[PDB]
Design a protein around this ligand. Structure first.
Ligand code: TAD
Ligand code: TAD
Ligand code: TAD
Ligand code: TAD
Ligand code: TAD
Ligand code: TAD
Lengths: 233, 233, 233, 233, 231, 232
């Protein structure tokens, strides 16, 4: 009766934090709460290094931190397909990849994300307009956020999003958590504690290997983010 | 050279969450960061049932969760003295109890709190005025908050806090993660997940004893908060 | 397939304005837009004089203004049942009266209101707690507003509303209005035009009978609102 | 004794809405209210197609809607001069034309506008600086807005406007209902009701001719707004 | 062109650059409409009978006001209200000054939005006093929160009805040197140089006028207006 | 207890009660920490080579600064910077004054508002090595009403955060925003600026009719010296 859903979260996870994990908890409670869906699985998909984002450390490490973070998760797992791509892959292709994989009574894959990601649809050249359309019309978004009217507004201001609003589920986050990866790296560079902001095993892995520093933050400096490069050219 | 410091936090811890542990980490980085102090220990002291606060579940439950929460901490521990007293004890007595206990070169106990508690100083009949003075003049306050200017202002607006401002340290939390006990109890009453908001051992203990509910929320309904009863009469 | 719905707006309509009529258009588009409902009728039900609200003019006139306002509406009508009650009737009973009437495959009546009304649920004694419960659980509320996180938040802070959140639909209204009856009456007493804020026929009816003045505003001065008097005593 | 005044509003009126008409009502109450003026007429002057604004439908439709909107008004009418010119006309010329036309103890024509228009004086190349000076110095400006202190600040920040401020009247709208033309088109594209947001005859005219759509919104896409083209090149 | 006399009542406990600033702002504004001509400014310190918490001796407040205006061509201090052994309503102070001028310029009350909004504080003003002040004299209300004052006026049928006699003067230079904050600064021994005129600063320092003790004067005592009007 | 000298660089166009208030606030703060003793305050107006739009002749600015502090027991004016032919970096001004004191030696600290601090992010306005040296070897006493604005600006910058022990954020609780810009605007419109600046500065401006639409246009279109030098 209810539609089975698989939550897919793409992102750089640089590094993964408690907020990324909360995203799944919140979305699951929300989708299951509607009485219309059954969340069967969650997937964390770290982006490959060809994404070229500034300060992005090696994919293998981000994949290991995510596995450590979901070690004790009964329903959330890590998928490495994206991390292994020599050519950065569009989110639309990742969704397609996962939907097809499930096909091989079939659960539907929905993109799990936050407000920022939804709003980035308006950054020039970051997304191919046709991609935005197929993502909302054929897959769906589960957008979690502390600024719900911020997202509702953004959806209202765009004809394509408004038209497919039935597939964009905005999930309010009442507990104010804004544990960004960027503030974690900043904390690490300064020798500050990040305990209780990221799983214990992740924090331990990061400190053991000094993964984050001024130097790592410099990776890809002056380089153009893959999507931008490819959509402008 | 450096003044050694023991950070003490009184509160209901109903229940303890990642945020209370996070307060300790933050306060310690800040105090050690000044170069003028060395934080040798943190103490979590749950309030005894005589506090009579609404929704306050039994102290043994709150103490065990706080103990489970700090089990894997190397410097934060729980002290049960206050929870075991038959009569509710003023924060100043708790600070004094602990300061004396250390005398037996001697570390200074300092109160660790959020802006809310600092602000509660103005609540009529909540604090004896000589208490506030002794606390800030003889012990000290380490006030952690996301609303820095709020606290700075509160201090600026009181002749006494301002006079002793050198003994009051406002610590800014740039990684906003406000996991209140109230929001946790609300989530629990609603069957929502609190995974990653509190230590796994705390969650497991909450689950096993089905701790928070509409009925628990009702405890002490209509009773008058202990310090209010005492200071009024 | 789709659930048929009848929207019922209770209120003083003192006087009815363009925003009251907008409520129906918005709600209808929203409900039919979900693809899960079919709005078959709108009902404006002006409150009887026994409600005793300060400044409330005779019900006969409020009913006439509502009739004139919906003269050209194909689906929104006026029901006088409430206006004729010698004893003020609780909204729950009005809802019940209309649902029973429909039972003579049966459409469901839902209360159409704005966020102000939803929030009035917290005014001490204004609403019987069990009434609120039965309204959200057995009928439903379609709440329109320019402050949706206003309403969303109000629902999140109440266990009973949250529990029945599936029966409460928040409809964002992006075209920022704010045309309260109270400001229309203030305008009239000041001899200001209210054309284009209310239907032409309503404006003309008001002008012809000098309905609103300082005298009309004093009606019921010093009298307690019916629900308050009945729930307190 | 009292200076007679003719309020003139230039604009695209694409489409006209209840808000554009309320604007005249408010300004009239204000100007007459001061005891120093007598408003004898209001003129809506739709901009011609040569303005080249994106999404601007043909002037005949906009003029007709505007006439339908004012058919039932006793003092506000539509003037077509501006729209009949082959070349887009500077607002100052439109004002001059009308002042001259009245000289055929003579009423003063004053520009009637919202805050948006006022603030557009800062847009690079949108207005020749001598035009601004002449408009405010020789005719006058009646600025109706819900952001009164906003308009006041904009005037304070400009030497030109401040110097002639006695000829600028900021009228506060306390009964806000910002029904922008942009939001009306947005609603039309989406099949949403606009009943009670525009005069019934406008609404019916739009509906009979299916006026707004994705296609109309594209008109002049990529074409440079006439004033910009003129004052730049 | 109507001649206007700006009358400012209040504690001036102590007078600050902001109070003086009020006159300059109002003058430029009224004179700027072309419909008026400001001829004089009168600072009138309230008498000690007002009984407001922290109010120091009128002798000092009068003296500081005089020092503040010593070099003022058009603003002066009127010690009448101060020498009143019985606290006088603002209306009566306006009358006193109107009647004094006829022995003809119109006296208008100069003030801030606080004072205007205080019309809503229970029993602080006799409603007929409000009506007569706005109706028969006029308010020149200076403020940084202009919409604060406009909304307050819009919300009251009485003030609205007399809106033409209530001139709201915006002040765009965000400065709010309240007396309260000057006292606070002095109790804590911080400098207030450049927030009040040099002579008032020097006067205050030389006599250690403000303190925890001076702040406690009249503690627990009801405000004159509140007493008279409630009983 | 470390002896300190507060040095304020800026256009001072014109100086107002607020710039003066800035010194009083910082000195009270610094002395109140019980770790410092503020011995002197120096106001140093930028030279005309700054080329900032609306910047009137440096000589007038210096004189108003002198009149403003004529009665100041501890704050004085220094024309060295205004007399240089080429616009001088703040780092060089600080250095020049620290070297002048060396002739138990007092430390010169830059006194500024949040704007200047935040200006560190303006592209090409400051050499990054210059920022590091100013904060590491001299220090910043930043006065402001938006304390969290500044605290946050510091928190977001690794170099500033790193040297935060040398950056003191002093909260101004008595809002006192008398910007030079608003003073010039008021004067152009003939409004009174009495009690916004010291009486003597006010009298001087009046006597010389200093600010006008015309002066406000000085250097119109000219690129600010730092931006010019750092882009080339
Ligand atoms: N297909 C395309 O054209 C395209 C353009 S960008 C893009 C993908 O978008 C991603 C960008 O990742 P990133 O590093 O910028 C983001 P990051 O990895 O930090 O975020 C992962 C997810 O968590 C969300 N999130 C983060 N913090 C919060 C919070 N505090 N509250 C609620 N939600 C939160 C983010 O919006 C995101 O959806 C990449 O995976 C990239 O491949 N696809
Ligand atoms: N001595 C007295 O007169 C007196 C009056 S009240 C009082 C004591 O004060 C306590 C009040 O406890 P409670 O249950 O209300 C508080 P709770 O137990 O929730 O808080 C514990 C501590 O965390 C702080 N804190 C909480 N959330 C945050 C946050 N999100 N960010 C930063 N800091 C935060 C609080 O200020 C407090 O210091 C009691 O234990 C009581 O004994 N003493
Ligand atoms: N059953 C009870 O215990 C109970 C308590 S009060 C109550 C009923 O509640 C009603 C209160 O009526 P009233 O005069 O206070 C309200 P009014 O008649 O002014 O409003 C009618 C409806 O329009 C809504 N509304 C008005 N303006 C807007 C706007 N600008 N934007 C969005 N929505 C708007 C209001 O929320 C309301 O739902 C009465 O009918 C009363 O009988 N029932
Ligand atoms: N002369 C020039 O150099 C010059 C440059 S632009 C210009 C003219 O200015 C015009 C602007 O056209 P447009 O498309 O923006 C007209 P639009 O139809 O959008 O607006 C008409 C008027 O209503 C006002 N208004 C709108 N909404 C509100 C509201 N919600 N509350 C209060 N007031 C409101 C607007 O500011 C405007 O004055 C054009 O007609 C153009 O010819 N003249
Ligand atoms: N007649 C009555 O019923 C009545 C009630 S209160 C009253 C009189 O009202 C006065 C209240 O004096 P007080 O001590 O409370 C006020 P204070 O003396 O501090 O203020 C004097 C004036 O300056 C204004 N002002 C203050 N700060 C600002 C600012 N930052 N910006 C712009 N304007 C500002 C105030 O509103 C006031 O008009 C007294 O003189 C009292 O006699 N009369
Ligand atoms: N060295 C470099 O690379 C570099 C780039 S810009 C620069 C210097 O920075 C200066 C900029 O001067 P300017 O004319 O832009 C600023 P202005 O002269 O107006 O300011 C003087 C001082 O007052 C502070 N201040 C201003 N308003 C307030 C307020 N309201 N509250 C608290 N404090 C305040 C300012 O930050 C500044 O430190 C110049 O002297 C210039 O030489 N150095």
């Amino acid at each position: 009766e209810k539609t089975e859903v698989v939550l897919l979260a793409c992102g750089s996870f640089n590094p993964i934090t408690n907020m990324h994990l909360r995203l799944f908890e919140l979305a699951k409670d929300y989708m299951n709460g509607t009485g219309r869906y059954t969340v069967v699985k969650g997937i964390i998909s770290p982006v490959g290094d060809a994404y070229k984002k500034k300060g992005l450390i090696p994919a293998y490490h981000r994949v290991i931190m995510a596995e450590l973070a979901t070690k004790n998760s009964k329903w959330v797992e890590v998928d490495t397909w994206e991390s292994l791509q020599k050519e950065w892959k569009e989110t639309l292709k990742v969704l397609r990849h996962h939907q097809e994989k499930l096909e091989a009574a079939v659960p539907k894959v929905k993109l799990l994300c936050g407000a920022d990601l939804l709003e980035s649809f308006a950054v020039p050249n970051l997304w191919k307009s046709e991609d935005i359309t197929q993502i909302v019309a054929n897959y769906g978004l589960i957008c979690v956020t502390r600024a719900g009217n911020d997202a509702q507004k953004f959806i209202y201001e765009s004809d394509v999003l408004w038209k497919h609003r039935s597939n964009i589920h905005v999930v309010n986050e009442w507990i104010a958590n804004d544990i960004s990866s960027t503030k974690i790296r900043r904390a690490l560079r300064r020798g500050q504690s990040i305990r209780y902001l990221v799983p214990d095993l992740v924090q331990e892995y990061i400190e053991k290997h000094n993964l984050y520093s001024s130097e790592s933050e410099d990776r890809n400096a002056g380089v153009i983010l893959a999507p931008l490069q490819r959509n402008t050219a």
